[PDB]
Design a protein around this ligand. Sequence first.
Ligand code: SRM
Ligand code: SF4
Ligand SMILES: [Cl-]
Ligand SMILES: [Cl-]
Ligand SMILES: [K+]
Length: 538
Amino acid sequence: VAAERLEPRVEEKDGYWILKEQFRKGINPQEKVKIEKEPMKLFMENGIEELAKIPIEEIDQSKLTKDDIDVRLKWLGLFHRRKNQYGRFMMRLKLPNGVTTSAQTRYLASVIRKYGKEGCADITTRQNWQIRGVVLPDVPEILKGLAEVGLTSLQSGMDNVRNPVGNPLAGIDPEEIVDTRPYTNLLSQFITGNSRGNPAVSNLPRKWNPCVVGSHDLYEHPHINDLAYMPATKDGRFGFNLLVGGFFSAKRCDEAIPLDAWVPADDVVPVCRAILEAFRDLGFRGNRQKCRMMWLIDELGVEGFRAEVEKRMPQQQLERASPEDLVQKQWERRDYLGVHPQKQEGYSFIGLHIPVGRVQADDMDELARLADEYGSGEIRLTVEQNIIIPNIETSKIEALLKEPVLSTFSPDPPILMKGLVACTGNQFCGKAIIETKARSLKITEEVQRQVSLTKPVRMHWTGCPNTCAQVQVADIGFMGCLTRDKNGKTVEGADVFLGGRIGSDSHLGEVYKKAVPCDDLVPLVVDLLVNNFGAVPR
Ligand code: SRM
Ligand code: SF4
Ligand SMILES: [Cl-]
Ligand SMILES: [Cl-]
Ligand SMILES: [K+]
């Protein structure tokens, strides 16, 4: 690779970072949008105030403002549901480590409550909140209300650093390696400029996923993140080995690979900045399917990429990876659903199943009430779109288990429901080929009626090849497709994936059977469970 390839392609201009004029040839349309107007101005120069006052019908009549609502608003966490819910916006937060409060939960519920049938909320596969039904005129007030309860929505979509994922058992688990909350909190604060906005990292070639590991279980899925911090001692010091470039896409899925780098714990933010700077500065900005960070690593090679990170470290040192990390390979992923003792004596946490991550405002108020009456006001989200309420005096558990709402959000659902994960699908997502959430519930219920099992089989349903519900990590994955019934009529289908493994011995699953009509999935899945996962016909 030439020395010329290493020339930074972006420059700071008026507090923002923009593509240098020599590197603007052949860029994709999204890069054009970013050049035409810096998205961060909608927040940092309060451009949202004036945009929000324009009727949508009129917004749609010019390119600049249509690009504002359909693309630039994703820098403010706002996603126009143009096809399936015209004029309404899904809104996505930053929620490092999945940690929320009862007050935050009540505030979000109060927002969606206003929108009635157009509102609801969802836990995401990055242990994050999404809310729905938002109208543009309400945006200025919602942004103020979020700030008031200590939330931000900044930089949560498009070409930005996504929600920092950590250990859902951080601080409470007797077996944790290192509490991940301080580090995911620092990362989020760094990425969003302490909720003011951070333009140094808001103009990447593409989305970029971080996680910090603190569990032997690897609840954080480090193998599928752009940057994963793996806890490791080096020369007597606590820190992290770094894995880089994991990603899923319609074209390619790849697991993260060692950068061959270790940082002390205090260097978590400096190396996150160095890697993002290298990615921002040097990454390809053509075909969107070749813009993820792994593609840069493949072009430069891991050593060439590593050198770029190294020059962007303070004092310009990057130590080599330590031989062995702290994650024990001898480990069985623990079920966190149900009631479990904390490391603080006399306290328990409870894991509650949220069916396919979907909640309404009344449900959110109930969960917030439980967290206040039984816990410490804290609610934790998980990447299986479930919840944990920590910090419950164990003497209160008898009473808690009698709460009516626990019959809906159960601490002990059937085993197949425990592991069930589903993306938004075509109820709201315009890219979706099929309906996912209702369908996956109905199918899973009918399957579980027919078989009993002991192994915790994880089933993931995703509505299109973007694979937001990560079908490549599942024991059985279902990817939306259109197919044909026996009479040649169009019907919703799934491509069925097998082979996905998580934890230290991770593996990416692959298509096993294409184009299965959804209405035929029950018998197929019953047989797979009996033949491959030890299930027993009832
Ligand atoms: C909500 C969520 C799925 C869920 O039900 O849980 C989601 C939903 C969306 N994803 Fe995703 N993705 C979500 C996690 C994922 C993950 C899983 C992960 O992060 O571990 C992946 C695969 C992992 C990865 O990216 O490496 C992912 C892969 C993407 C892709 C393909 C990325 C690529 O490189 O090609 C897109 C399309 C794109 O960015 O070009 C997509 C884009 C979309 C959009 C924004 C599509 C569009 O705008 O309509 C979806 C919004 C639908 C809606 O209204 O909810 N989403 N998305 C997740 C929100 C996570 C969060 O809180 O930040
Ligand atoms: S996998 Fe496809 S259908 Fe599901 S939320 Fe992602 S983009 Fe939408
Ligand atoms: Cl996006
Ligand atoms: Cl859409
Ligand atoms: K769930």
